[PDB]
Amino acid sequence: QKHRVAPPPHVPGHLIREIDAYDLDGLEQGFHEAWKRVQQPDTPPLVWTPFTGGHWIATRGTLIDEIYRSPERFSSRVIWVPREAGEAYDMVPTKLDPPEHTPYRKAIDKGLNLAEIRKLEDQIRTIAVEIIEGFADRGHCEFGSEFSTVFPVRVFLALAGLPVEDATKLGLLANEMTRPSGNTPEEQGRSLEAANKGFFEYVAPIIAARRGGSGTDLITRILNVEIDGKPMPDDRALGLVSLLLLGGLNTVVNFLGFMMIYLSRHPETVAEMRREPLKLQRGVEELFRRFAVVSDARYVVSDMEFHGTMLKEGDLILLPTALHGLDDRHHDDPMTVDLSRRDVTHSTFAQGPHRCAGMHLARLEVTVMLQEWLARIPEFRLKDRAVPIYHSGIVAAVENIPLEWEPQ
């Protein structure tokens, strides 16, 4: 049963589209394919859906890029749909606008900057190799449960100095954040609230122990960056450490599944990566253009007209980032991975002050994964007649990716 809200007076009927971000029409064919259905040659740049409490959707890459870059007009005070969930959302610095945002991003950058991430390469590689060698000789694996849900999680827990046995409970919380249970805005609001509270509960004792700590882990490093000459306050720290976990454990996991499904169906592309190691390294950004995973929102600051559309203060706009990288107006043949594409511009990591803090880590993890995968399993395919199961939400998800190959 579908829950609809009535459009407000300022929303004209010709802009209304029945789009359910948590259950996209056509989702069985793929998350990216389902979002692409929304982006027809003449659809308005901004459309409004009565689902998920009622909100706008930006349908073209230029709007998505622009909105991310304009925090003074499009605020981060709410970045989730439905509104109830977005209002319950308590993660730092992602809930913040400049200038409050900036010192917390600085703190994060102390741990996640490119020079720090480069130091992590060999530890990431070791984890990759270890997992891959578990099944490489076997000639088949279920890629989701045997690799994509394992690799980025072990990497991040190691980096964060946390026990790997916590993976399960943290993945469960993460999934209730990005796809909160419920068929109703109020239900989803509650689901998100309980998950966000679970993160705070888990993270509180760690914060208390690592304040002033001498650990070399990511949490200790970031926790102990001063904020305006003072220790980071408790409320902020809870939201900050929870966000680290949320970003580290869900994002790359999901991305890898979508990426691998495409690769398993395009051996010519795989062969190119295998024969030119530099095309692989240089081609990773094209993969990020092609396999966006995040669809989140911004809050309209003031009554305004934007791309010919009347917007009211408090309106939410969902930003399906796939609709930038896959916008046929930004990239010719957007659905094809072209490792040589010169222009790969995309919003897979968003734009503006919130542009992904973990993007260097995400690129390194993917780069190392492909290098170590192709070294040991150079050719592979999706099992015959296999059907991946897809989910849409704030972060896309996919499971059931049975791969097959001939042991080398």
Ligand X SMILES: CC1(C)[C@H]2CC(=O)[C@]1(C)C[C@H]2O
Indicate which single residue of 49, 94, 188, 309 sits in contact with ligand X (rule: CB under 6 A): 94
Residue 108 binding: pick among ligand HEM, ligand X, none (C-beta 5-8 Å cut-off by kind): ligand HEM
The two tokens of residue 195 are: 């998950």
Residue 348 binding: pick among ligand HEM, ligand X, none (C-beta 5-8 Å cut-off by kind): ligand HEM
Any residues with CB less than 8 A from the CB of 165 and at least 6 apart, and which?
none
Per-residue binder mask for ligand HEM (CB under 6 A), 68-87, x = binder: -----------x--------
Q: Does 295 bind ligand X (CB under 6 A)?
A: no
Indicate which single residue of 67, 218, 222, 246 sits in contact with ligand X (rule: CB under 6 A): 246
Backbone angles phi, psi at 65, to 5 degrees: -55, -50
- What's the closest the beta carbon of residue 394 comes to ligand X, in angstroms? 6
Residue 91 binding: pick among ligand X, ligand HEM, none (C-beta 5-8 Å cut-off by kind): ligand X
| 195 vs 232, beta carbon nearer ligand X | 195
Q: Does 178 bind ligand X (CB under 6 A)?
A: yes
**Which residue minimizes CB distance to ligand X?**
247
* Number of residues near ligand X (by CB under 6 A): 9
Indicate which single residue of 297, 395, 396, 397 sits in contact with ligand X (rule: CB under 6 A): 395
| 54 vs 247, beta carbon nearer ligand X | 247
> Which residues bind to ligand HEM, rule: CB under 6 A?
79, 93-94, 105, 108, 243-244, 247-248, 251-252, 255, 293-294, 296, 321, 348-350, 353-354, 356-358, 361-362
